[PDB]
């Protein structure tokens, strides 16, 4: 009886697989000769963050362009201005393990979480003029991977629990849950309709999630190793993956398919942070080898290297009105490319 | 040039900088342990002595230095992508129990798991800090069970203190360096701070040790 | 959070006095602090500052030496102590505190004033000083400046205040732009160097009182010099 089952599961996996197959027709490779590629890419080092004394894991950019916060081991995280580099704040951590923090679109919170399974949202704007601790969203059962603020009211959490959760940050408890990944979830990202988000695990397998619903409407396999970073793209109808394979294999929404993998012979150890440009021409790459890569998006061809950095990259932020770009490693740096 | 407000905040910056620089040098004159090990393999009695949901930061002092651990293997989650967070930490505590050298494998688990934590790629120069818990009662299973159960290769008097001997070496042949990591073992003496003792003195060792290093006379 | 301020009392021309202002509700170590004199008739005038952790100090021309200003964090408190004080200092002093971050927003409070009697700049300019207004009409109340106020790096550091009879003013408009805290939405800036304007649109009770146009590019301190509202 449960063979049956077994065989019925294969078999629908076996059908989508030569649906998917059926549906695909053509490369993106062989049509984007075509148009010409950018070509070569400078980025020259405009400012410098030396403010932590510790290995940094997460960082973040306002929907302001202007303000970023760096989270490092040390147990306190800051906020930074990009323009003239000043300290705004820096707010200590219960915990100094820390994995992600996120930024509010309004700015007036901040979410941040470690390996206590807890993200805790400080609040910004206070009458106190002081940063105290908002809220601590407990329960998560599991290392958090990365927290995502949706509104003031609304964040989405990924834990080692295997699982995500979107929360309610004026009552305390997750509204949704998520689940159904066999390994845990390292990476979350949310598209700018902010109507769906993806997760990725140590499956080697991306899943995207109905927010309004609240359950998976599909998967997408592929994948060889762990997944550490997923960026979106700005139209929202694809998106760009990365792992310990150095392979950014990319996948589209309403194609529900792989378009092409990015894999160099150059490059073999993983991939911490993917991010893409407000046009969509070229995605960013952060590697584990010290350097960031930056590909063309379309031409899936190498289009230069920013090695700016002397040690792995945990981190990398573009700025969503597209002027620059950050870049934090672990040598306790934040570095600004234009 | 600059306003006045952007003097203020230029000002109101370098304030927070030397904050932060004397919290960093508070900091830096701490120690950091890793502690971790299989199931009640005794951390339970370890926090016990070194006191008066996934990390568990043990927080005491000694005659100085103010020590910090953070046990992590009480909870159950994932093996080996959070562990490179412990990155620069000043030592590990490794903490087996005798008496489950006849309950099942589990030593061979145990080996495993200190052979992960011991070539582990970021561990390449960290100490490593063994303790053996409930030896009496080893002793006495040792005397009502024979010993080559746990190794078939392994032969020999089953005596207590040879046996305790070549348990110790076969621990500690399993690093593959032995240049830059050592290997500090215990027997977990009584419930006394002896045990605390030999840790603040291993940790003295091995500080001196990488002082040494980073001065190059090492 | 509050501010009170005590340690005022009549002098003799010639003498010395030392006021306190003791604050709560509020890290009293990051802000700065900032004195400033009300005239028995005229308009605000800043007195002197105090820079987070006596990093810095500044005082106006006119009580430079003479008086002389300190801080205790510990205890969140503040000392105003003047010496040979003349018999024009008789006013009331406000004590207010300002955070310089980005985005943020100086002189967010004040205190509740304390009266005293004894018995180069950047000159702000309101043209009027007395316009009657009923409720329900909007109404422009416009300020000049003897300088554009605009900086190189896009800001324009001017702030407008509200003072109703009987209590200290509050921060109405900061950088002419930005509505603070708490402030009814109701009000709005515009304008350029030199020349600026503050619009209420649909005027309630409440309204009515002395509207203070503030410069802070550089030091001093200059006020506008204030338009009062008539019913």
């Known amino acids: 009886e449960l063979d049956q089952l077994r065989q019925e599961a294969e078999q629908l996996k076996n059908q989508i697989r030569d649906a998917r197959k059926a549906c695909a027709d053509a490369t993106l490779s062989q049509i984007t000769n075509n148009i010409d590629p950018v070509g070569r890419i400078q980025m020259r080092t405009r400012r410098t963050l030396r403010g932590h004394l510790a290995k940094i894991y997460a960082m973040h950019w306002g929907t302001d362009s202007r303000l970023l916060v760096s989270a490092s081991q040390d147990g306190k995280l800051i906020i930074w201005d990009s323009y003239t580099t000043n300290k705004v704040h820096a707010i200590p951590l219960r915990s100094s393990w820390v994995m992600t923090c996120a930024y509010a679109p309004s700015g007036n919170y901040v979410a941040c979480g470690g390996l206590d399974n807890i993200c805790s949202i400080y609040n910004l704007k206070t009458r106190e003029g002081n940063v105290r601790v908002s809220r601590e969203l407990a329960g998560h059962t599991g290392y958090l991977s990365c927290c995502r603020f949706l509104d003031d009211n609304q964040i989405v959490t990924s834990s080692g629990d295997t699982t995500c959760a979107l929360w309610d940050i004026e009552t305390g408890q997750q509204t949704t849950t998520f689940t159904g990944h066999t390994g845990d979830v390292m990476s979350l990202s949310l598209a700018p309709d902010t109507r769906l988000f993806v997760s990725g695990a140590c499956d080697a397998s991306a899943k995207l999630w109905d927010v309004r619903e609240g359950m998976c409407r599909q998967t997408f396999t592929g994948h060889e190793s762990d997944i550490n970073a997923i960026c979106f793209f700005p139209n929202g109808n694809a998106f760009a993956t990365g792992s310990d394979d150095a392979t950014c294999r990319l996948f589209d929404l309403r194609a529900d398919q792989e378009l092409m993998t990015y894999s160099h012979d150059n490059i073999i150890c993983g991939i911490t942070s993917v991010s893409f440009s407000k046009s969509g021409r070229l995605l960013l790459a952060g590697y584990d080898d010290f350097n960031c890569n930056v590909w063309d998006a379309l031409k899936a061809d190498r289009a230069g290297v920013l090695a700016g950095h002397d040690n792995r990259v945990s981190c990398l932020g573009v700025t969503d009105d597209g002027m620059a770009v950050a870049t934090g490693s672990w040598d306790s740096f934040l570095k600004i490319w234009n | 040039t600059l306003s006045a407000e952007d003097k203020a905040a230029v000002e109101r910056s370098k304030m927070i900088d030397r904050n932060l620089r004397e919290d960093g040098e508070k900091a830096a004159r701490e120690v950091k342990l890793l502690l971790l090990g299989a199931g009640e393999s005794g951390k339970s009695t370890i926090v016990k002595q070194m006191k008066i949901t996934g990390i568990v930061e043990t927080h005491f002092t000694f005659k100085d230095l103010h020590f910090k651990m953070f046990d992590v293997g009480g909870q159950r989650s994932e093996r080996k992508k959070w562990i490179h967070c412990f990155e620069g930490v000043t030592a590990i505590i490794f903490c087996v129990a005798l008496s489950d050298y006849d309950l099942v494998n589990r030593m061979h688990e145990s080996m495993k798991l200190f052979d992960s934590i011991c070539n582990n790629k970021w561990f390449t120069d960290t100490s490593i800090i063994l303790f053996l818990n409930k030896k009496d009662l080893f002793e006495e299973k040792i005397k009502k069970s024979p010993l080559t159960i746990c190794y078939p290769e392994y032969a020999g008097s089953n005596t207590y203190e040879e046996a305790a001997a070549y348990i110790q070496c076969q621990f500690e042949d399993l690093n593959k360096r032995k240049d830059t990591k050592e290997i500090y073992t215990h027997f977990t003496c009584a419930t006394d701070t002896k045990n605390v003792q030999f840790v603040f003195d291993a940790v003295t060792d091995v500080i001196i040790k990488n002082n040494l290093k980073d001065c190059g006379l090492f | 959070v509050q501010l009170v301020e005590s340690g005022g009392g009549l002098v003799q021309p010639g003498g010395s006095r030392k006021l306190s202002c003791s604050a709560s509700?509020?890290?009293?170590?990051?802000?700065?602090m900032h004195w400033v004199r009300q005239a028995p008739e005229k308009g605000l005038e800043w007195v002197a500052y105090?820079?987070?952790?006596?990093?810095?100090?500044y005082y106006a021309d006119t009580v430079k030496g003479r008086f002389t200003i300190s801080r205790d964090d510990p205890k969140n408190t503040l000392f105003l102590q003047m010496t040979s004080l003349r018999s024009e200092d008789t006013a009331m002093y406000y004590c207010?505190?300002?955070?310089?971050?980005?985005?943020?927003?100086?002189?967010?409070?004040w205190g509740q004033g304390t009266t005293l009697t004894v018995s180069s700049d950047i000159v702000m300019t309101q043209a009027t000083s007395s316009v009657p207004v009923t409720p329900g009409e909007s109404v422009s109340i416009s300020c000049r400046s003897s300088?554009?106020?605009?900086?190189?790096?896009?800001?324009?550091?001017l702030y407008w205040f509200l003072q109703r009879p009987g209590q200290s003013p509050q921060l109405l408009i900061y950088?002419?732009?930005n509505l603070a805290s708490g402030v009814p939405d109701r009000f709005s800036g515009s304008g350029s160097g030199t020349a600026f304007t503050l619009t209420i649109s649909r005027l309630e009770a409440e309204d009515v009182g002395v509207y203070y146009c503030?410069?802070?590019?550089?030091?001093?301190?200059?006020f506008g010099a204030g338009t009062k509202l008539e019913l």
């Open positions: 207010v505190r300002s955070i310089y971050y980005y985005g943020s927003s100086p002189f967010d409070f």
């Open positions: 509700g509020f890290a009293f170590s990051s802000f700065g």
């Open positions: 105090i820079s987070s952790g006596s990093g810095t100090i």
């Open positions: 300088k554009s106020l605009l900086h190189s790096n896009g800001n324009t550091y």
């Open positions: 950088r002419m732009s």
């Open positions: 503030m410069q802070h590019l550089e030091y001093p301190l200059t």
